[PDB]
Design a protein around this nucleic acid. Structure first.
Ligand code: MG
Ligand code: MG
Ligand code: MG
Ligand code: MG
Ligand code: MG
Ligand code: MG
Ligand code: MG
Ligand code: MG
Ligand code: MG
Ligand code: MG
Ligand code: MG
Ligand code: MG
Ligand code: MG
Ligand code: MG
Ligand code: MG
Ligand code: MG
Ligand code: MG
Ligand code: MG
Ligand code: MG
Ligand code: MG
Ligand code: MG
Ligand code: MG
Ligand code: MG
Ligand code: MG
Ligand code: MG
Ligand code: MG
Ligand code: MG
Ligand code: MG
Ligand code: MG
Ligand code: MG
Ligand code: MG
Lengths: 168, 176, 159
RNA sequence: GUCUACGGCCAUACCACCCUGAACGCGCCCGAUCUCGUCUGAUCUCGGAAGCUAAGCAGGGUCGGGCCUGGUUAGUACUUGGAUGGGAGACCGCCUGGGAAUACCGGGUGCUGUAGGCUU
RNA sequence: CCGUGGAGCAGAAGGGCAAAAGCUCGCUUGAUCUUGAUUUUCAGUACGAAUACAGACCGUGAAAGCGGGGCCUCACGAUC
RNA sequence: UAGUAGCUGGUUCCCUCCAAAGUUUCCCUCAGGAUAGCUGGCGCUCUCGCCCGCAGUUUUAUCCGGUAAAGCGAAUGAUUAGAGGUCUUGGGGCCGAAACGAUCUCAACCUAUUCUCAAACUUUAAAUGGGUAAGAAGCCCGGCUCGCUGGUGUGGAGCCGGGCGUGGAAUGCGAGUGCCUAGUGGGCCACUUUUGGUAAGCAGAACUGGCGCUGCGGGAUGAACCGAACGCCGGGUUAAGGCGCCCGAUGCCGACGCUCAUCAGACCCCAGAAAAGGUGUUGGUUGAUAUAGACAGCAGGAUGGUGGCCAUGGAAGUCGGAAUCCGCUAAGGAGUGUGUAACAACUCACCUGCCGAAUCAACUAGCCCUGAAAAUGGAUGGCGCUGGAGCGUCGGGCCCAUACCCGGCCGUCGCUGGCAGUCGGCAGAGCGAGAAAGAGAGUGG
RNA sequence: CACGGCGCGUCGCGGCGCGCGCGAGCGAGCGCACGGGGUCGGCGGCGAUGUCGGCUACCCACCCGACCCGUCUUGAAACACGGACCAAGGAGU
RNA sequence: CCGGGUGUUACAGCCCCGCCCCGGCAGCAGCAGCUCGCCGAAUCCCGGGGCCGAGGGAGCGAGACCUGUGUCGCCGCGCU
């Protein structure tokens, strides 16, 4: 048997509101930059990220994004955080200035670095503003319960791509 | 488990991570009936945690793949050994069904359990599924379909599509 | 309400461990504490002189004053919504060097040594402790023996 | 191989009984003028060297007790977080993580620091 | 002869204690004079209680040391 | 004299921004104050367009604990039951003048076991959790001062000078600091933990979130439940919940079953029910016997010792006490029941004839039914619904919130953003362009 | 095939890479557009005493929503208290 | 024609099994427009319906030998 390498990149979408959140869950959501329902972001995986996501399992749906999902998310919803301002990325020079020192100079560099989790994935992801996704067309199964028991919360390995296709 | 839609049968094999104590732990294989591979892996971890001293954090899914039906065109009799939880006590049972696919038979089993004993998928623990010869079948509801010259009519056909001609001057016929 | 005694609710905290009563081993007395060591507090009921208050039991502080028999240490205490770094005097029995700092010190010496080395070699070496990375791809070899089936066992009552 | 003086960790070192101890040493042992102290030179203190491993002490033994360390019990008990799960309730099942303790069955029975000896 | 405390340590209880913190003797008055710091309740204020010091006079012991009250946790009181 | 009032009542325009507390300590303090806490306003010191810090979070190390659990063949304290020993004593007897000389015993005792326990027990001992560290204020050198400590320029501390930048876990984020200060100091509710109480929409705590201070979609209705928090609008999509009609949405040729109620059932909080039962029906578990011919059903037998022994006035089998044998048999119990005072008589167990293939139990769990009685007429929200519009497991599609996405508009905050360059026949129209800096001025080959 | 000059070519490994000069880092026009937020260089009717426009405001109808304010309070539509209606005066100086 | 019985290819068929090039041939997640999947750097084309159009001096080239114009920047192209 050939066990493939554990995925290094995950996509996380907040699927619960602001009302009535435990302080610890609130702090972890703030750290992950999910301050609004149907916000999304990329997270690189390690022990710290695993435990951090486990703490906030009931509030997020996360999975392993596909290359097409990364492409579509960057091109359609991708805005850059330039000068503490949310600027839509309509030209390569905006990327080139904010990430020139890291040899990211266009959309292709940004997408490649995000998808392969490069040496400066932290800088690229932080430059990337959190994605504001629309409500899932076709509806959710059940927001409250876990994905394994027929809900939407928790970890879904590759079904996050199906979710993204309708949420963006 | 949420028995959503029609179930699928998955072969899942897993093992503990290598440790200084033992280089190569034995691989354990199980048949899981599940809507998809994610819940299949979850059920595998649950069952193997009950059986052996194994946990997902101290293990790994070596392989997980759907196993397709060998003969999906031959109607077969399936015997299922099952273990379920009632409102007071747990019971082992054996039920036979009649279908073309093992996954279809197991889905029938889940629906029948829900219908007859109000047992839920998180309560049912499926144990064994075997093709059973018609001579070895012992439930009359399955045995009564074992004859060469099967013959029966459709006595009282209830009119469907009752609303497409919502106002019709006939009184419908139920004998065809 | 409760009582404001200094030793209320310490019958287990200040007690001695099982089969460990009697003479205090002298190694505790024969340790050297200087100015600035990170040190742990653990009240020992065998000696009653210089016993720390129960709220500092299990806390870690920094030594700022060394005296004939006792040591003054600065330790943080959470009082309501604020933390006070207050200094207390504890006799040497109820104190113990913290091993949380020596690991970092040894790491500092070791990565400083490996930074000094390879400086002439020009190669690259990692110093920051990266978190546990995800497991990489590998092959699991079956040795001709197929994995054995696992099935749930039937219910049958024990009691 | 091992002992003495001072120790560190304080039973893997303790407890009961049995066997063996070459040399040095440690002891038992012989006396009370002096130092010293008792009802009593028994203890303590002092002065010695006839005898002895009897005892202490050291090593070893016991399908030994204990102790120490593993397996089993056991993914059991318990438990963080979740559900418009079940149940009249009492309580229970599941999802996400952590995860014990008896009985029972194995292995072991002091390591070591400084100084000074014996084994010429 | 056995005896890990199954006794005692003023008192309630709990903790602690075996060539001792218990019992018996010898000598003494650190229960003395003095400025600060700190802990306990706490507002981080007092009183009360307590803890490490420092400066003198001492006690005890061969000495190292120990002692400025009671083995620790309670036994107490502003302005005028 | 407009006496005082910690107590009632009232307390007059708009928009914008921020936004609480019912808790700590003291008070003749408990309907009130003071003080911390929570708020606002005013600022100030720096910061980025290599690096500093900080965190209701994790990771890697390292300590702290005595709850949940467990244990009593471990200490303390409770606690059931039998085993084996002895004289260590006592108690009923017995042979003995007496004798631990002897017989049983009952006991206390000892040794191994055994059943069940602890908020004020414990050898063990979690999960969740509480500290500390993760570098420049750090490491590595050289040298001075000391009245302290000193076998010893010993130890320690403070000083100077010098060298090392891969800024030494992840993630996120500008930070620090100072004045002045209102209101508050009646709280309540919910999951989980938990004390008193028979219990309570009772009384009292811990953590978190809410209500109060808050509107919106759903639960018919509703301070707290589920979803979601709000500037004025258009489009799209959802959450929770729903889609017979009221009432937007299944007017799907939806899937598989279960259930008949002369009191059916119908969705967290939540608004009503238990023990015990059913040959109603549907599943399941276990054990039997049946072509050496069962289960019914229809018919024949259902005997002797002996009216067995003790018995009672009478007990022949049938009120009572043990046992329960034999020969005859295809079979008959010293008897399963009805009957008389006793019999008698009937009947059963058991075996035969006809009939010729499946039949018996004992449990267990679903729905339904009995258990099930209150007062104005009455409420799955109503109508009503039974090839469901009920119950369980499920699939597509559809409906809509002030939530989410796109767009417009108002305002606030931030960029402590840009513009004095309107530089014009005296001029030459730029400083948006990935790369710290001159559309530079002139002199020689 | 986002290949396209000549050379001196080691700026070179065996040519490709890859450097030094070539008036020395200046070829120009037109045109189309998935290109830093809509235009038409496109049109059609009805208009003098019966017709055109008038958000709001006057009256009326319909569907949906909708309990009376102020106050104390944990909690007010309350079977808690003040309030028939109108004008003027009326309380942090 | 039906029912009952026997049985093992007969006047039907079914299942498994060595090979014959895994025997050979299409074809292949099949418009035999539903027998069962996951997808698209391994994905492009065309069409229909609904709502909106906020903003308003972006410059080009002309060269101190001229002073025009209002279709301009980035990007993708075509012709000489
Ligand atoms: Mg909520
Ligand atoms: Mg739709
Ligand atoms: Mg919830
Ligand atoms: Mg003597
Ligand atoms: Mg000896
Ligand atoms: Mg001997
Ligand atoms: Mg042993
Ligand atoms: Mg030695
Ligand atoms: Mg020799
Ligand atoms: Mg003494
Ligand atoms: Mg002194
Ligand atoms: Mg004393
Ligand atoms: Mg007045
Ligand atoms: Mg008052
Ligand atoms: Mg009042
Ligand atoms: Mg406690
Ligand atoms: Mg307990
Ligand atoms: Mg209450
Ligand atoms: Mg609020
Ligand atoms: Mg609210
Ligand atoms: Mg209701
Ligand atoms: Mg809308
Ligand atoms: Mg409705
Ligand atoms: Mg917007
Ligand atoms: Mg209405
Ligand atoms: Mg009032
Ligand atoms: Mg109020
Ligand atoms: Mg009244
Ligand atoms: Mg009143
Ligand atoms: Mg009135
Ligand atoms: Mg007026």
């Amino acid at each position: 048997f050939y066990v493939p390498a554990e995925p290094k990149l995950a996509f996380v979408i907040r699927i619960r509101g602001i009302n009535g959140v435990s302080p610890k869950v609130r702090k972890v959501l703030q750290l992950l930059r999910l301050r609004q329902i149907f916000n999304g972001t990329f997270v690189k995986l390690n022990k710290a990220s695993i435990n951090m996501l486990r703490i906030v399992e009931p509030y997020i749906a996360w999975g392993y994004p596909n290359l097409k999902s990364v492409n579509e998310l960057i091109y359609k919803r991708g805005y850059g955080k330039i000068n503490k301002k949310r600027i839509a990325l309509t030209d390569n020079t905006l990327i080139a200035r904010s990430l020139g020192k890291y040899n990211i100079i266009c959309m292709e560099d940004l997408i490649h670095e995000i998808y392969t989790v490069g040496k400066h994935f932290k800088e690229a992801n932080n430059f990337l503003w959190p994605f504001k996704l629309s409500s899932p067309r076709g509806g959710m199964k059940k927001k409250t319960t876990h994905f394994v028991e027929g809900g939407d919360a928790g970890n879904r390995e590759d079904q996050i791509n199906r979710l993204i296709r309708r949420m963006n | 488990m949420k028995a959503s839609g029609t179930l699928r049968e998955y072969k899942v094999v897993g093992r503990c991570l290598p440790t200084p104590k033992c280089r190569t732990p034995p691989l354990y294989r199980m048949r899981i009936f599940a809507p998809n591979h994610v819940v299949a892996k979850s059920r595998f971890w649950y069952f193997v945690s009950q059986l052996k001293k194994m946990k997902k954090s101290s293990g790994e899914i070596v392989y997980c793949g759907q196993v397709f039906e060998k003969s999906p065109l031959r109607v077969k009799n399936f015997g299922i050994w099952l273990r379920y939880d009632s409102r007071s006590g747990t019971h082992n049972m054996y039920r036979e069904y009649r279908d073309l696919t093992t996954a279809g038979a197991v889905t029938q089993c889940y629906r029948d359990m829900g219908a007859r004993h109000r047992a839920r998928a998180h309560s049912i623990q499926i144990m064994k599924v075997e093709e059973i010869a018609a001579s070895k079948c012992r439930r009359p509801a399955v045995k009564q379909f074992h004859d060469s010259k099967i013959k029966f009519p459709l006595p009282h056909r209830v009119l469907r599509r009752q609303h497409k001609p919502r106002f019709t001057t006939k009184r419908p016929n139920t004998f065809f | 309400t409760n009582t404001k005694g200094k030793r209320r609710g310490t019958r287990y905290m200040f007690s001695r461990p099982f089969r460990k009563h009697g003479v205090v081993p002298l190694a505790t007395y024969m340790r050297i504490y200087k100015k600035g060591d990170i040190v742990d507090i653990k009240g020992m009921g065998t000696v009653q002189k210089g016993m720390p208050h129960k709220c500092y039991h299990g806390k870690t502080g920094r030594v700022y004053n060394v005296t004939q028999h006792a040591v003054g240490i600065v330790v943080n205490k959470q009082v309501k919504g604020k933390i006070l770094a207050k200094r207390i005097n504890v006799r040497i029995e109820h104190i113990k060097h913290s091993k949380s700092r020596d690991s970092f010190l040894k790491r500092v010496k070791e990565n400083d040594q490996k930074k000094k080395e390879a400086k002439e070699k020009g190669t690259w070496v990692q110093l920051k402790r990266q978190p546990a990375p995800p497991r990489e791809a590998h092959f699991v070899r079956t040795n001709g023996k197929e994995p054995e089936l696992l099935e749930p066992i039937p219910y049958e009552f024990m009691a």
